[PDB]
Amino acid sequence: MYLRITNIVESSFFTKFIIYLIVLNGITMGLETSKTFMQSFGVYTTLFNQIVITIFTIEIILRIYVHRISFFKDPWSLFDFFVVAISLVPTSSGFEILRVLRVLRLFRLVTAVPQMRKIVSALISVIPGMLSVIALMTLFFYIFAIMATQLFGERFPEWFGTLGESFYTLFQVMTLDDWSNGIVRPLMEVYPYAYVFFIPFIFVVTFVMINLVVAIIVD
Amino acid sequence: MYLRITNIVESSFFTKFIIYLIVLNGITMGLETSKTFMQSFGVYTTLFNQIVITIFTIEIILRIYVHRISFFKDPWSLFDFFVVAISLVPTSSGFEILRVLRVLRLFRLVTAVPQMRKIVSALISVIPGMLSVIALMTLFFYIFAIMATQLFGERFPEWFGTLGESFYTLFQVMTLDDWSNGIVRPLMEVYPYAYVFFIPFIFVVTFVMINLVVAIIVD
Amino acid sequence: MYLRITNIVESSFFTKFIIYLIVLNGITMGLETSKTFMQSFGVYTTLFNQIVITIFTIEIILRIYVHRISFFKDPWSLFDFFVVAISLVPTSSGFEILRVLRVLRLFRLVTAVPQMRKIVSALISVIPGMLSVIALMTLFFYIFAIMATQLFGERFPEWFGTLGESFYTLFQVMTLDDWSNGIVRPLMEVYPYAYVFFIPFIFVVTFVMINLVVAIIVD
Amino acid sequence: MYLRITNIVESSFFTKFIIYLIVLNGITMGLETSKTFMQSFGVYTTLFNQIVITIFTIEIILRIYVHRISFFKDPWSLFDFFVVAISLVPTSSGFEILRVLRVLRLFRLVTAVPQMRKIVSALISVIPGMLSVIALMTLFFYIFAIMATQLFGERFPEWFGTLGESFYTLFQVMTLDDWSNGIVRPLMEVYPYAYVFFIPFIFVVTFVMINLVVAIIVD
C-alpha cells in the first residue's frame, strides 16, 4: 500500500453502485428524448447528469491509481476512459455531435457487467477468422466501385458520380434493397446492358458471404 | 364421482369431439369473413360460436376438477384457459378488440394434438440460450434509438421524432426494409454524413444476427 | 405383348434419342417466344413440336408394356406420364391457358437424366421431416388472415379485404417485401397500433424459418 | 540466355516487387475516378499506367520461357495474362468498355498473393459441388421464363415482353426485390391469378437455395 482503498473498487458493492448509476443516467437520457420532460424537469436532470459525470470521472481516476500503467491495456477501461472523457467536453459547445456522443456511455452497462462483456467478447472473437474474406471483399468493392464510377457516373451522378457514391450504392445493391426497380432498371434505360455488370456482381458478393457463414459454422 | 368424471375427460371421443368442433369453428370463423354469407346465414354462425364456446367452456370446467392444481401447472392448459377465457367476454363489452382476439382459440388445434405440442416445445426450447444475445441487442437498440431521435427527429419527425419511432424505424432498417432508397438516402440530403450512423448500425445488427444462429447451430 | 418391343426401350438409342430431343424441344421452345421468329418460321416449329410429343407419347406406351404394373408406381415415369398427357392437350382453342402448361415438358430433362433425379429426390427427401412445421404455419397464417381481414379490410380492402387477400399480404410481409413503408406505415396512419400485429408476426414467422433450417441441419 | 534466365525471375525480391506495383496502380486508379485529380496529374498517371503494363508485360514474358507449357496450365497466370492483355489495347480505340476493363488488373493482387489465392481457390472448389444444382436452377428459370413471356408480355412488355426480360424479372423476384407491390400486384390488376405462378415460384427457388447451403454446411 500503495492501496488504501484498493480493496474497494475491487469490492462487489462499489461497482454495482456504478452499474446502478449507469442504468439511472441511461434512464435519464431516455426521458431527455421527451420535449415535455425537458420543459418540466430538465433542471433535475442536468445536474443529475453532472453528478453521474463527476462520480464517473472520479471512479476512473481511482481505477488508474490502483492499476498504474496496467489499466491501459484493458480495452474495456480504455473504452471507459474515452467514453467518459467524451461525456466531458461541454454540451452546448462547438459541435453538437459531441452532444450525442455522450450517450455512448450507456454502453458502460456492457463494460461493468461481465455477462455483456462476455457476449461482446464472443462476437468480436469470430472477427479474426473472417479478415481474409473481409480482405477479398473490400478489394472487390474497391475494384467494382471504380468500374461503376467510370461506366455510370456522368449520366447517373446521384448514384455513381464519385467513388464513395459507388461504394454506398453497391453496398445497397449488395444489401439487395430495391436493386432492380430502384437502380438497375433505370440504369438500363440508358445503358441496356448494365445487368451484365450488376447481375454478376450480385452473384459474387452473395456467393462468398454465404460460404463465409458456412466456414464460421463448420467447427 | 371423482373417478367417474376422470374417466369421462380422458376418453378418446371427448378429445376428438372438442377437436372436431375446433376444426368446425375455425371453418365458421373463416366463413364469418364473407359479408354476403353473414347476411344470409350470419345468425347460424353467431350462435354456433357460442354453442361451441360453451361446450369448450364445459371442457375447461371438467378438466380443472380432475386435475385441481395439476391443471394450473401445465403451461399449455393455462393458455387454453386464458384463450377460452378471453373468448368469454362480450362483443358489446369494452371495445371490438376481443372480438378479433377470440380467433386465438384456434391455437387449441395445436394445444390438443400431441404431435404439434412437441414441435412447439422443441421450438420454444431454442429460446432460453438467446436471452443473452437478446438482451445485448435490446440495449444497443435503446442507445441507438436515442441518438437517432436527437439527431433526426426535428427534420424527420415521422421516422425519428420519438424514441418509439426511432425504434420502429430501426427495426425496419434492421430488417433491411426499403432501408436505402427509402430512408438513408433521404436523411443524407439534409444530414450528408448520416451514412456514418446507419452503415455501421447495419453491420452490428447483421453480424450479431449471424452469430445468434451460429451459436444456435453450434450449441 | 412383352417380348418384341422390350428390346427397343431399355436400349441406349431409345433413352439417348428421347433425351437429346428434350434438349432439342427446349432449344425450340426458346424461339417460339420471339414473335419475330414466329412470323418467319412458326410453321416449322409448331410441327417440330408436334413430332416430339408424338415421339414422347408412343415412348410412354411401350415403357408401359415393358414395365407393366411397375410403371404407374414409379414417380419419374409417372411425372413424364403426367407431363406428356398434358402435352397431349388440344392445339386448337378449347381455351388458352393449358397451352402454356406444355413447357413443363422440359422437365423431362429432369426425369431422364440420373444426376438431376438424385438432386431432386435428395431435395424432396428433406420435405417429410419438415411437414409438422408447415402445418403449424398454415394454422398460424390462417389464424392471422382471419384476424387481419377483420382488423384492416374496412379501410384497406386491397391488402386485407378478403381472407385470401390478407393471406397474400401476409405471405409478402413474411418474405419481408416492402413490408414497412409499403404496408404497415400506412396502416399505422389510421390504426397506430398495427405494429402490434406485424412486428410480432414477423418475429414469429422468422423464428420458425430459422428453426426450420436447423431441423434440416441435424437431419 | 534462352534457358538460364529463370534465376533472375522467381526470386523473393521479384514476386513481392510486382505486388508493390499493383498497390500503387490500385491507388493511382482510384485517383482516375476523380475528375478534379485528372486535371493536375492525368498525364503523370497516364504515363504511369503503361509503364506498369509494360513491366507486367515484361514480367509475363520472362515467366513463360521459364515455365513454358506449364505457364498456360497455371490458372492464376492465365488470368495474369489476359488481364494484362486487356490492358494492352490502345488508349483511344473504338470500344471504351475495354478502357474500363483495365482496372480488372487490380485483381492480380488475388493471383499473386497465396493467402488471397487461398480464399479464392477455396471458394471456387465449392462450385463443382453445386453444378448439378445450378444446371437445375437454370433449367427451372428457363422454363418459367418461357411461361412468363407467353403469359404476361403482351400487356406487360417492359417486364415480360421477351425471354431475357422475363429472366431478369424472374431473377428479380427470386432476390425477392420489390416483388409484390413492385411486380406481382400490378400484374394482378390485369391477371388476377398471377400469384399462382409467383408464390409457388418463390417457394421453389427459396427451397433449392436453402437446401443447397445445408449440403455445403454438412460437407
Ligand SMILES: CCOC(=O)C1=C(COCCN(C)C)NC(C)=C(C(=O)OC)[C@H]1c1ccccc1Br
Ligand atoms: C421504448 C419501447 O419501444 C417503443 O417505444 C415502441 C413500442 C412499445 O411496445 C413494444 C412492443 N414490443 C414487444 C415489440 N411499440 C413498438 C413495437 C415499437 C417498435 O419499434 O418495435 C420494435 C415502438 C413504436 C412503433 C411505431 C409507432 C410508434 C411506436 Br411508440
Ligand SMILES: CCOC(=O)C1=C(COCCN(C)C)NC(C)=C(C(=O)OC)[C@H]1c1ccccc1Br
Ligand atoms: C436467406 C437469408 O436469410 C437469413 O436469415 C440470413 C441472414 C440475414 O438474416 C437477418 C435479417 N437480414 C435480412 C439482415 N444473413 C445471411 C448472409 C445469411 C445467408 O447465408 O444467406 C445469404 C442468412 C443466415 C444468417 C445466420 C445464419 C445462417 C444463415 Br443461412
Ligand SMILES: [Ca+2]
Ligand atoms: Ca423496396
Ligand SMILES: [Ca+2]
Ligand atoms: Ca423490401
